[PDB]
Amino acid sequence: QSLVADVGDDHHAWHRLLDQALNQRRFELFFQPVVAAQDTQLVLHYKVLSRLLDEQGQTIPAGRFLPWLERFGWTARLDRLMLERVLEQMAGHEESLALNLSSATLADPQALNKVFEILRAHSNLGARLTLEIGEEQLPEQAVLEQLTRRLRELGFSLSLQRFGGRFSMIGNLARLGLAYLKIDGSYIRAIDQESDKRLFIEAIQRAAHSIDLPLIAERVETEGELSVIREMGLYGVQGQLFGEPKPWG
Amino acid sequence: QSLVADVGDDHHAWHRLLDQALNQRRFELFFQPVVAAQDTQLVLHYKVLSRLLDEQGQTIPAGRFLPWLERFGWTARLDRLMLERVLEQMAGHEESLALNLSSATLADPQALNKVFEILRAHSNLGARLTLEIGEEQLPEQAVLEQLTRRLRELGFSLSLQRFGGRFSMIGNLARLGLAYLKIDGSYIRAIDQESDKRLFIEAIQRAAHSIDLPLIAERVETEGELSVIREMGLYGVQGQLFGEPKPWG
Numbered sequence: 001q002s003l004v005a006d007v008g009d010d011h012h013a014w015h016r017l018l019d020q021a022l023n024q025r026r027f028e029l030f031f032q033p034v035v036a037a038q039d040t041q042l043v044l045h046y047k048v049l050s051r052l053l054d055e056q057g058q059t060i061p062a063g064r065f066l067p068w069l070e071r072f073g074w075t076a077r078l079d080r081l082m083l084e085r086v087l088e089q090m091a092g093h094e095e096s097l098a099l100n101l102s103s104a105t106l107a108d109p110q111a112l113n114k115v116f117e118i119l120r121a122h123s124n125l126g127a128r129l130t131l132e133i134g135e136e137q138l139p140e141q142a143v144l145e146q147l148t149r150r151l152r153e154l155g156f157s158l159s160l161q162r163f164g165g166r167f168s169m170i171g172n173l174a175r176l177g178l179a180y181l182k183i184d185g186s187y188i189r190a191i192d193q194e195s196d197k198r199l200f201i202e203a204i205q206r207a208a209h210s211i212d213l214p215l216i217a218e219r220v221e222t223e224g225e226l227s228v229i230r231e232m233g234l235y236g237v238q239g240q241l242f243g244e245p246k247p248w249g
Numbered sequence: 250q251s252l253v254a255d256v257g258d259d260h261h262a263w264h265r266l267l268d269q270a271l272n273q274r275r276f277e278l279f280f281q282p283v284v285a286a287q288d289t290q291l292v293l294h295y296k297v298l299s300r301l302l303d304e305q306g307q308t309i310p311a312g313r314f315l316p317w318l319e320r321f322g323w324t325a326r327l328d329r330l331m332l333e334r335v336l337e338q339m340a341g342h343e344e345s346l347a348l349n350l351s352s353a354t355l356a357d358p359q360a361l362n363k364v365f366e367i368l369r370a371h372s373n374l375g376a377r378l379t380l381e382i383g384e385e386q387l388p389e390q391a392v393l394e395q396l397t398r399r400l401r402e403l404g405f406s407l408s409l410q411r412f413g414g415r416f417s418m419i420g421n422l423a424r425l426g427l428a429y430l431k432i433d434g435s436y437i438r439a440i441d442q443e444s445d446k447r448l449f450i451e452a453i454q455r456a457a458h459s460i461d462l463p464l465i466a467e468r469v470e471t472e473g474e475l476s477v478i479r480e481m482g483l484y485g486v487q488g489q490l491f492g493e494p495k496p497w498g
């Protein structure tokens with residue numbers, strides 16, 4: 001009596017699938033450890049990744065659904081849901097967490113306010129949660145500035161990720177008080193085996209260091225990459241080398 | 250008996266206008282001094298700018314026609330013409346010059362060979378002429394590498410310009426033996442009045458210096474911008490502050 005069809009690239013299927021998941025809270029929290037380059041047994045925080053566990057049992061990665069949530073203008077609904085779930089699960093432990101915010105939320109000032117209202121409701125978790133924005137969807141300088149101020153006021157921290165293409169604006173970061181900067185994986189990929197990549201990394205680390213901004217390398221896959229990242233003095237690392245995204249533990 | 254019409258955005262007019270200019274050698278050489286940031290009375294070279302002097306007497310800037318030469322696939326014809334004219338006018342003096350090469354020329358291996366043939370014909374000017382490529386139209390790493398090798402072999406030098414967005418590849422420049430790197434004007438614009446721009450410039454200068462690659466700032470307009478560029482240790486400057494593009498002298 002129960003049939004299933006392949007959803008593929010069908011906008012109808014996706015629309016139905018996602019509106020339902022949003023309404024029914026079908027999204028679950030996955031985590032990846034973010035860890036000190038100098039001593040990988042030392043955990044900085046756990047990055048929270050969104051997982052859709054559909055009715056047929058399969059888990060769907062944020063990389064897969066986020067573009068559809070965008071297309072339908074629901075990314076703000078996702079953040080509201082993700083943020084409330086994360087603030088709830090943090091009651092159970094003492095670890096620090098990082099969670100993305102999309103531009104849809106930052107642009108829409110009502111949504112953005114709702115976020116702050118929620119945060120204000122859990123000022124006791126402030127020190128344990130960092131919000132991240134991917135370089136792809138940075139708002140304007142003045143929005144960055146107001147966002148960081150409000151968060152610092154509420155007791156929470158802010159960070160950027162997938163950083164690198166916009167090194168231009170490194171100077172513009174000097175007063176934001178970011179917790180850290182996550183460097184896109186492409187700039188460290190196979191860097192033990194591609195030394196020409198090092199000079200850029202050396203430049204970012206030195207400039208970021210002069211403004212007190214720790215660097216954390218993304219998507220580290222290899223003991224080789226890790227050894228270079230560590231050698232060159234970066235603060236943190238994350239990636240498949242420390243495991244796949246998994247549920248809490 | 251002689252009438253003229255406005256050429257505007259008319260592809261027909263432009264096609265006719267440019268094919269004629271190319272065939273009849275209607276392009277003239279303009280120059281801008283490129284000068285030491287530490288001592289602006291000290292001239293590094295003169296950048297050669299292409300000017301179309303049409304029949305109605307008006308002069309048309311490369312910025313205006315190059316996009317049409319592209320559209321029609323004639324940019325290689327322009328380089329051949331520009332390069333031969335430049336090598337001819339250098340016989341008259343002892344100044345150093347810099348001249349662009351387009352991607353159309355670098356891609357087409359026959360054209361590229363013609364260039365080398367011409368260069369080989371004037372090996373006596375090698376030390377006085379630098380070829381430049383804008384960051385917009387950099388070829389692949391291996392083409393850059395072969396191009397620089399052949400030029401160094403012929404006795405000529407090579408440089409990149411409008412550099413900045415691709416700081417990623419700074420490491421990839423370490424063995425090219427570029428004569429210098431020209432920094433896009435946007436990174437120094439009003440930099441005495443926009444200090445957040447300095448940290449990026451500091452990063453480029455330090456990384457470029459570690460690989461022996463002098464930095465030269467483009468499109469400097471202001472005594473203020475100049476004073477910062479000089480303070481921060483960059484090698485060279487060019488722009489409207491030292492005059493408009495004019496014919497030889």
Ligand SMILES: Nc1nc2c(ncn2[C@@H]2O[C@@H]3COP(=O)(O)O[C@H]4[C@@H](O)[C@H](n5cnc6c(=O)[nH]c(N)nc65)O[C@@H]4COP(=O)(O)O[C@H]3[C@H]2O)c(=O)[nH]1
Nearest residue numbers: 049050061062063082100101102219220221239240241245
């Ligand atoms: N090739 C490679 N890939 C690796 C490696 N390590 C982790 N990854 C993958 O790349 C992403 C890493 O997490 P992210 O940087 O936070 O990047 C995140 C994050 O920016 C975003 N995202 C995830 N959850 C949320 C969310 O709840 N809200 C918002 N607005 N965005 C989210 O989308 C990305 C997540 O996509 P995911 O499908 O979860 O894909 C994950 C993860 O599975 C590695 O060593 N190599």
Ligand SMILES: Nc1nc2c(ncn2[C@@H]2O[C@@H]3COP(=O)(O)O[C@H]4[C@@H](O)[C@H](n5cnc6c(=O)[nH]c(N)nc65)O[C@@H]4COP(=O)(O)O[C@H]3[C@H]2O)c(=O)[nH]1
Nearest residue numbers: 298299310311312331349350351468469470488489490494
């Ligand atoms: N806002 C501002 N602008 C300034 C300033 N100083 C100079 N400029 C302008 O910007 C360009 C500077 O020369 P360029 O960097 O070599 O940049 C050149 C060069 O890359 C290219 N080009 C010029 N001649 C040739 C040529 O013979 N062959 C090729 N392939 N390209 C050429 O197109 C550009 C020239 O366009 P132009 O129309 O000649 O425009 C010139 C010039 O008039 C300044 O202080 N402020």
